[PDB]
Amino acid sequence: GRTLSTKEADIQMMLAAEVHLGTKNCDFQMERYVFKRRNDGIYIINLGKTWEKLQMAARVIVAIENPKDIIVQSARPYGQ
RNA sequence: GGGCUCGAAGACGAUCAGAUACCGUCCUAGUCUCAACCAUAAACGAUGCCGACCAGGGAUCGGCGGAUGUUGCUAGGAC
Ligand SMILES: [K+]
Ligand SMILES: [K+]
Ligand SMILES: [K+]
Ligand SMILES: [K+]
Ligand SMILES: [K+]
Ligand SMILES: [K+]
Ligand SMILES: [Mg+2]
Ligand SMILES: [Mg+2]
Ligand SMILES: [Mg+2]
Ligand SMILES: [Mg+2]
């Protein structure tokens, strides 16, 4: 048994989706979220910080009284 | 002292209205070196020297520290 917590399952899903795979370059202001660099050169993102930031963004979004005042847009085809 | 080459000056051949030029041909000084002078250049980064702070990134030269795997090589060298 040992049912996983919400954070556990969320991070498992993120790993399944490869959310933790960065690029070969790191922005100096994104370094605080990167865990370490692998021998290949791809930076590994700290999924705990990603989950915490997702929770923080949800906290910010929920406080908007009218959801119609929020606009979400994606330039790339994948995120549309 | 050297004097190959190129080549101020000079002399010719062209072009041109003229052509003391640009183009072509032959050449003196010079161009090289030694001894002694000269002390000037858009001698430019058109940007004094010393010292402190001040964003990010990838390359590159020299030295050094660490890790790691190869080398038709001799712990080292190359990566
Ligand atoms: K000569
Ligand atoms: K001459
Ligand atoms: K003329
Ligand atoms: K002089
Ligand atoms: K200059
Ligand atoms: K450097
Ligand atoms: Mg001659
Ligand atoms: Mg001389
Ligand atoms: Mg002067
Ligand atoms: Mg070096």
mmCIF file of C-alpha atoms (C1' of nucleotides) and ligand atoms in Angstrom:
data_model
loop_
_atom_site.group_PDB
_atom_site.id
_atom_site.type_symbol
_atom_site.label_atom_id
_atom_site.label_comp_id
_atom_site.label_asym_id
_atom_site.label_seq_id
_atom_site.Cartn_x
_atom_site.Cartn_y
_atom_site.Cartn_z
ATOM 1 C CA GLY A 1 0.000 0.000 0.000
ATOM 2 C CA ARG A 2 1.620 3.198 1.279
ATOM 3 C CA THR A 3 -0.535 5.611 -0.696
ATOM 4 C CA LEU A 4 1.537 8.499 -2.017
ATOM 5 C CA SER A 5 0.883 12.081 -0.990
ATOM 6 C CA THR A 6 -0.320 14.656 -3.505
ATOM 7 C CA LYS A 7 3.202 16.039 -3.920
ATOM 8 C CA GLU A 8 4.619 12.534 -4.421
ATOM 9 C CA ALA A 9 2.168 11.671 -7.197
ATOM 10 C CA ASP A 10 2.591 15.103 -8.790
ATOM 11 C CA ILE A 11 6.373 14.735 -8.932
ATOM 12 C CA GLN A 12 6.008 11.185 -10.260
ATOM 13 C CA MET A 13 3.806 12.523 -13.063
ATOM 14 C CA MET A 14 6.322 15.295 -13.757
ATOM 15 C CA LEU A 15 9.115 12.720 -14.013
ATOM 16 C CA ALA A 16 6.975 10.637 -16.366
ATOM 17 C CA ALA A 17 6.493 13.763 -18.498
ATOM 18 C CA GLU A 18 10.232 14.630 -18.371
ATOM 19 C CA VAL A 19 9.511 18.016 -16.780
ATOM 20 C CA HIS A 20 12.928 17.901 -15.075
ATOM 21 C CA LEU A 21 14.964 17.884 -18.317
ATOM 22 C CA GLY A 22 16.480 21.291 -19.040
ATOM 23 C CA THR A 23 18.670 22.485 -21.883
ATOM 24 C CA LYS A 24 22.468 22.627 -22.125
ATOM 25 C CA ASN A 25 22.530 26.282 -20.998
ATOM 26 C CA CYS A 26 21.349 27.841 -17.738
ATOM 27 C CA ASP A 27 20.283 31.434 -17.188
ATOM 28 C CA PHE A 28 22.022 32.991 -14.199
ATOM 29 C CA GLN A 29 18.608 33.902 -12.758
ATOM 30 C CA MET A 30 17.266 30.358 -13.268
ATOM 31 C CA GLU A 31 20.231 28.738 -11.496
ATOM 32 C CA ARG A 32 18.508 28.743 -8.095
ATOM 33 C CA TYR A 33 15.957 26.254 -9.474
ATOM 34 C CA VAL A 34 18.471 23.934 -11.171
ATOM 35 C CA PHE A 35 19.713 21.030 -9.063
ATOM 36 C CA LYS A 36 22.886 19.930 -10.859
ATOM 37 C CA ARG A 37 24.398 19.448 -14.308
ATOM 38 C CA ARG A 38 24.717 15.934 -15.701
ATOM 39 C CA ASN A 39 27.793 14.625 -17.506
ATOM 40 C CA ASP A 40 26.088 15.117 -20.876
ATOM 41 C CA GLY A 41 25.517 18.790 -20.029
ATOM 42 C CA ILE A 42 21.731 18.865 -19.593
ATOM 43 C CA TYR A 43 20.712 20.691 -16.426
ATOM 44 C CA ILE A 44 18.357 18.844 -14.074
ATOM 45 C CA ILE A 45 15.534 20.965 -12.669
ATOM 46 C CA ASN A 46 14.593 20.620 -9.006
ATOM 47 C CA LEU A 47 11.033 19.293 -9.179
ATOM 48 C CA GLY A 48 10.281 20.251 -5.574
ATOM 49 C CA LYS A 49 10.822 23.918 -6.375
ATOM 50 C CA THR A 50 8.723 23.431 -9.512
ATOM 51 C CA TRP A 51 5.855 22.030 -7.433
ATOM 52 C CA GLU A 52 6.165 24.841 -4.883
ATOM 53 C CA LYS A 53 6.087 27.445 -7.660
ATOM 54 C CA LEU A 54 3.046 25.733 -9.181
ATOM 55 C CA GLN A 55 1.304 25.991 -5.808
ATOM 56 C CA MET A 56 2.323 29.652 -5.522
ATOM 57 C CA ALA A 57 0.995 30.427 -9.006
ATOM 58 C CA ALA A 58 -2.266 28.659 -8.154
ATOM 59 C CA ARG A 59 -2.507 30.750 -4.978
ATOM 60 C CA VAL A 60 -2.067 33.918 -7.034
ATOM 61 C CA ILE A 61 -4.592 32.810 -9.664
ATOM 62 C CA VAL A 62 -7.299 31.763 -7.196
ATOM 63 C CA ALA A 63 -7.343 35.244 -5.635
ATOM 64 C CA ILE A 64 -8.557 36.840 -8.892
ATOM 65 C CA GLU A 65 -12.270 37.448 -8.357
ATOM 66 C CA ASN A 66 -13.158 37.352 -12.065
ATOM 67 C CA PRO A 67 -11.352 34.595 -14.023
ATOM 68 C CA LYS A 68 -12.053 36.511 -17.249
ATOM 69 C CA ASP A 69 -9.392 39.045 -16.211
ATOM 70 C CA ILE A 70 -6.720 36.334 -16.625
ATOM 71 C CA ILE A 71 -5.226 35.775 -20.085
ATOM 72 C CA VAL A 72 -3.091 32.716 -20.859
ATOM 73 C CA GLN A 73 -1.394 32.465 -24.246
ATOM 74 C CA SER A 74 1.119 30.210 -25.986
ATOM 75 C CA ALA A 75 3.106 31.197 -29.064
ATOM 76 C CA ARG A 76 4.372 27.685 -29.814
ATOM 77 C CA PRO A 77 2.081 25.076 -31.423
ATOM 78 C CA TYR A 78 2.616 22.512 -28.652
ATOM 79 C CA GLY A 79 1.176 24.639 -25.850
ATOM 80 C CA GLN A 80 -1.872 25.923 -27.736
ATOM 81 C "C1'" G B 1 80.353 48.112 -48.164
ATOM 82 C "C1'" G B 2 76.690 46.255 -51.223
ATOM 83 C "C1'" G B 3 73.792 47.337 -55.159
ATOM 84 C "C1'" C B 4 68.926 41.347 -57.091
ATOM 85 C "C1'" U B 5 64.329 43.653 -57.144
ATOM 86 C "C1'" C B 6 61.440 47.732 -57.277
ATOM 87 C "C1'" G B 7 61.990 52.667 -58.050
ATOM 88 C "C1'" A B 8 61.445 59.604 -56.205
ATOM 89 C "C1'" A B 9 64.288 62.725 -60.050
ATOM 90 C "C1'" G B 10 65.080 62.259 -65.278
ATOM 91 C "C1'" A B 11 64.213 60.403 -70.256
ATOM 92 C "C1'" C B 12 60.924 58.214 -73.766
ATOM 93 C "C1'" G B 13 55.987 55.706 -75.677
ATOM 94 C "C1'" A B 14 50.776 56.457 -75.263
ATOM 95 C "C1'" U B 15 45.936 58.998 -73.839
ATOM 96 C "C1'" C B 16 44.370 64.086 -74.160
ATOM 97 C "C1'" A B 17 42.063 70.297 -76.251
ATOM 98 C "C1'" G B 18 46.633 70.383 -73.163
ATOM 99 C "C1'" A B 19 48.678 65.784 -69.809
ATOM 100 C "C1'" U B 20 54.766 68.564 -66.734
ATOM 101 C "C1'" A B 21 49.733 62.936 -64.635
ATOM 102 C "C1'" C B 22 46.882 58.583 -64.121
ATOM 103 C "C1'" C B 23 48.655 53.605 -68.246
ATOM 104 C "C1'" G B 24 53.337 51.407 -70.597
ATOM 105 C "C1'" U B 25 59.026 51.168 -71.361
ATOM 106 C "C1'" C B 26 64.368 52.380 -69.406
ATOM 107 C "C1'" C B 27 66.426 54.247 -65.296
ATOM 108 C "C1'" U B 28 69.663 58.068 -60.976
ATOM 109 C "C1'" A B 29 69.217 58.813 -55.694
ATOM 110 C "C1'" G B 30 66.976 55.408 -52.623
ATOM 111 C "C1'" U B 31 65.466 50.592 -51.289
ATOM 112 C "C1'" C B 32 69.928 46.369 -47.867
ATOM 113 C "C1'" U B 33 74.170 46.610 -44.097
ATOM 114 C "C1'" C B 34 77.886 49.105 -40.947
ATOM 115 C "C1'" A B 35 79.528 53.909 -38.175
ATOM 116 C "C1'" A B 36 77.464 58.745 -36.988
ATOM 117 C "C1'" C B 37 73.077 61.943 -37.353
ATOM 118 C "C1'" C B 38 68.112 63.210 -37.694
ATOM 119 C "C1'" A B 39 63.388 62.839 -33.597
ATOM 120 C "C1'" U B 40 59.090 63.446 -36.940
ATOM 121 C "C1'" A B 41 53.904 60.071 -38.618
ATOM 122 C "C1'" A B 42 46.044 59.348 -39.078
ATOM 123 C "C1'" A B 43 53.701 57.570 -34.058
ATOM 124 C "C1'" C B 44 45.389 55.995 -33.507
ATOM 125 C "C1'" G B 45 42.026 52.951 -29.268
ATOM 126 C "C1'" A B 46 42.057 60.085 -32.877
ATOM 127 C "C1'" U B 47 40.444 57.496 -25.721
ATOM 128 C "C1'" G B 48 47.111 59.519 -19.595
ATOM 129 C "C1'" C B 49 48.750 56.552 -15.285
ATOM 130 C "C1'" C B 50 47.559 54.156 -10.345
ATOM 131 C "C1'" G B 51 43.345 52.324 -7.136
ATOM 132 C "C1'" A B 52 37.882 50.692 -5.744
ATOM 133 C "C1'" C B 53 32.955 49.219 -7.151
ATOM 134 C "C1'" C B 54 29.974 47.910 -10.988
ATOM 135 C "C1'" A B 55 25.235 42.666 -15.566
ATOM 136 C "C1'" G B 56 25.273 38.179 -18.089
ATOM 137 C "C1'" G B 57 27.478 34.641 -21.743
ATOM 138 C "C1'" G B 58 30.464 31.719 -24.977
ATOM 139 C "C1'" A B 59 35.208 31.419 -27.164
ATOM 140 C "C1'" U B 60 40.693 31.924 -27.009
ATOM 141 C "C1'" C B 61 46.463 32.466 -25.113
ATOM 142 C "C1'" G B 62 49.876 31.354 -20.595
ATOM 143 C "C1'" G B 63 50.235 29.115 -15.741
ATOM 144 C "C1'" C B 64 48.094 26.220 -11.989
ATOM 145 C "C1'" G B 65 44.343 22.722 -9.091
ATOM 146 C "C1'" G B 66 40.849 18.602 -9.558
ATOM 147 C "C1'" A B 67 38.228 14.502 -12.235
ATOM 148 C "C1'" U B 68 37.918 11.101 -16.002
ATOM 149 C "C1'" G B 69 38.435 7.841 -20.464
ATOM 150 C "C1'" U B 70 41.262 6.792 -24.823
ATOM 151 C "C1'" U B 71 46.154 6.886 -27.472
ATOM 152 C "C1'" G B 72 49.881 2.212 -33.749
ATOM 153 C "C1'" C B 73 53.072 7.021 -28.178
ATOM 154 C "C1'" U B 74 57.134 7.205 -24.234
ATOM 155 C "C1'" A B 75 54.725 8.521 -14.835
ATOM 156 C "C1'" G B 76 54.351 11.764 -18.607
ATOM 157 C "C1'" G B 77 52.700 14.117 -23.620
ATOM 158 C "C1'" A B 78 47.812 14.593 -27.049
ATOM 159 C "C1'" C B 79 42.489 14.888 -26.416
HETATM 160 K K K C 1 70.474 49.571 -57.055
HETATM 161 K K K C 2 62.538 57.142 -61.847
HETATM 162 K K K C 3 40.408 65.635 -72.176
HETATM 163 K K K C 4 64.118 63.162 -39.231
HETATM 164 K K K C 5 43.426 53.952 -35.938
HETATM 165 K K K C 6 39.902 33.809 -19.517
HETATM 166 MG MG MG C 7 63.210 47.783 -63.662
HETATM 167 MG MG MG C 8 67.731 54.710 -45.203
HETATM 168 MG MG MG C 9 53.465 65.059 -33.181
HETATM 169 MG MG MG C 10 44.795 26.896 -20.346
#
